[PDB]
Amino acid sequence: QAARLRRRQLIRQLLERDKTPLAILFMAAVVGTLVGLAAVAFDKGVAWLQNQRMGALVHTADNYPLLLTVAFLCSAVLAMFGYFLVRKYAPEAGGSGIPEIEGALEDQRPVRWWRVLPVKFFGGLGTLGGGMVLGREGPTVQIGGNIGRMVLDIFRLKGDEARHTLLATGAAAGLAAAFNAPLAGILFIIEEMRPQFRYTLISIKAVFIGVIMSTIMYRIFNHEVALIDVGKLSDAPLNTLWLYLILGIIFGIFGPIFNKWVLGMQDLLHRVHGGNITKWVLMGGAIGGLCGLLGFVAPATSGGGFNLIPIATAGNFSMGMLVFIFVARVITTLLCFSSGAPGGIFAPMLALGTVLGTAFGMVAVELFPQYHLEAGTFAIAGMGALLAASIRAPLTGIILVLEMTDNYQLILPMIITGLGATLLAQFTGGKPLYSAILARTLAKQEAEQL
């Protein structure tokens, strides 16, 4: 009656599966190559700005108050340039980028590469070289999605498959070249950024080609540089997995509160300046200079956060130092991302989770020594646990931490901590962060139509 109707359609569909068009495969190769080159150039510009920042710091190493003022000024002017470019030329090129390029894969949120690529590139360059605690993945994944749309519009590809596949392969190429992590890009685009409530024709065989050419363009210009080089930690036996479940419960209790904090401060800071261009640029300059001066006095609360994950997994931190770094780092990340700067929050979540993981593993190693514990395996497990409770994408959290730490023997602690985080963030009332920001800006856009 109806099964006869669907069975012939299912046979006709299964006998020709996985036939994507060669036009889309070739444009996905060009998209992935351009996104890898743009991410390499963005990384080199950020590092050259930070090196010139440190050189201007050491240029006058005789007067301490003058050094603190020149640190504040040289970071604040770069932050003012980034906030001005974003706030004057492109109101949708500030923040993370993953909501504004995830809403573009659901046929809303128009991607405008001509007024995103230079402004998000140069503004994220300014506010990331200034020292503000932001991840260089969000600026490169919105650059990735917009390079995908730019190739689609230049070569005049038609169809509804080509647009979604090129936005997805641009975004996955951006996440692959930000972290040197090829598998995390595909597992981020088929688990988090595709439309979760309907059916779209994203071709994984083209997302893969974008990720391959992007990671090859990363490895051409980044030879023998590991982003995170932890050693080779001891394995976790079967009588120790309950501790990683407890750590997952702690991250799942913490995650939704971090979501509520970032969504609350991102309009508590709007209550300061009201939306004005000059007052927004002045407030952004104040917080960028504050994070730049924290880049000199106590130089662990600022920065991207990737220069303390190799420290906080081999010991080398006091408990008081861990609590001070966690408190001031959560303060500075909630101040820097939620103000409106161009910069993601993946990297100060992978750095904010390792501090909490070391602070739990250092408790657990002394609470009972009958297991012969180490305070580093709990940090490796808890790295992608705030990334699994806050943004609630545990599969790409676990895959990305397995990519950039290369400790496979902790895969069962990693999956148990990330999954306890996801479950206890669900049973607390924690909506995912990248969907909450997207739904918030869509409701704001709808209220601005009346």
Place this chain on the structure above:
Amino acid sequence: QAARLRRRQLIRQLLERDKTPLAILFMAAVVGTLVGLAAVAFDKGVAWLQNQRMGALVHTADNYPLLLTVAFLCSAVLAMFGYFLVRKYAPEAGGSGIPEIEGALEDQRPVRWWRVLPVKFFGGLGTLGGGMVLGREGPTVQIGGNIGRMVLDIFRLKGDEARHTLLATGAAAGLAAAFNAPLAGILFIIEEMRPQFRYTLISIKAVFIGVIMSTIMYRIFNHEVALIDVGKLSDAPLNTLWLYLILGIIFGIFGPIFNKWVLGMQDLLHRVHGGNITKWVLMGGAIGGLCGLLGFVAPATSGGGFNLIPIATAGNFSMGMLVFIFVARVITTLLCFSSGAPGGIFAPMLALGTVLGTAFGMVAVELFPQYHLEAGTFAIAGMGALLAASIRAPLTGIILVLEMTDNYQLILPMIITGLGATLLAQFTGGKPLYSAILARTLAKQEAEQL
């Protein structure tokens, strides 16, 4: 314009994203535990039958003709029992079973647990203890899906989300417990064994809990036992990725030829018995006896295929022995799987991929000594490449070879070989194997049945 209605439903759906019922999450925990226990009991039964079958020979080791006849009888009676149980009490238990579960996720080909579970269990036990070239993976993916449907019908869960989610977590727990690969168990569901043409409601968190509990129930019972133990090989520089591209092109133009072979041999052996029960069990007994005789004399062409996979990865295989193993393994895999025995092909395609990759690696390292190559890196890159060109599931092929070889430094040769394989299997024009078997057994059920 209906885009405003799509926006309003999108806001209401993004706020309520990833919120799975607690009943589904608990029942997927129970599915994971039961499929872990079923795969552990299945592996121990196959191990004990292989031990007794190969130990009775040296127990009664008088003379060589009697030794060969007792090898043939000791394998052929077990294979006769498996074929008879399949073709008498559950005809869907024949073959791999990933097509039957891949159909039952689309509300066709109904999973009768009370007929498949004991027949796939004991029949796969007989035909896999008989030393046949059959995977341990198929008869535990289908046992996993049937356990999932069993406990859904036991606890009486209604809805459409519960059925797809418990069948998907059963198949995921089966593939996680067959290979000790937790990540590939989820990655087979989210990109190969879901409904690939319409939206369905498989919650990834329940598949995650099922995979975790299944891998814990594996690792309790055979800890410190890895299936594939290769050493830390040499890394692959950037000027030698085009070699892995050429190896991917070789696998891609071999994939559809092997699919044509298995889908043709599955009728060429059907003409031998004509659907008759007596001639089918007699032909299957001759096949299983041949696979036991080959498992006794020249043993590295029979059995599951994980025994020779660390020898081929940089071991004592010559170019004259690798060709013999490849031709005899493809002839025995075809003759043993296309005849309808209960046993998957997903596990003896890893061995064929490793043999072809080792042959290419030994040609390449002799063809130029300027790159300082190795055959072992080509074997680990080409392991899950016939699995990416034949069943055309590249992401889970790459994930699974990353899982059970513990070499992340070859992730770029792995992805390049897998993508060369999928591309040059698509341009040649081969369908995926596990969908071109389901399309065949759906066209048969439509036309040749009613």
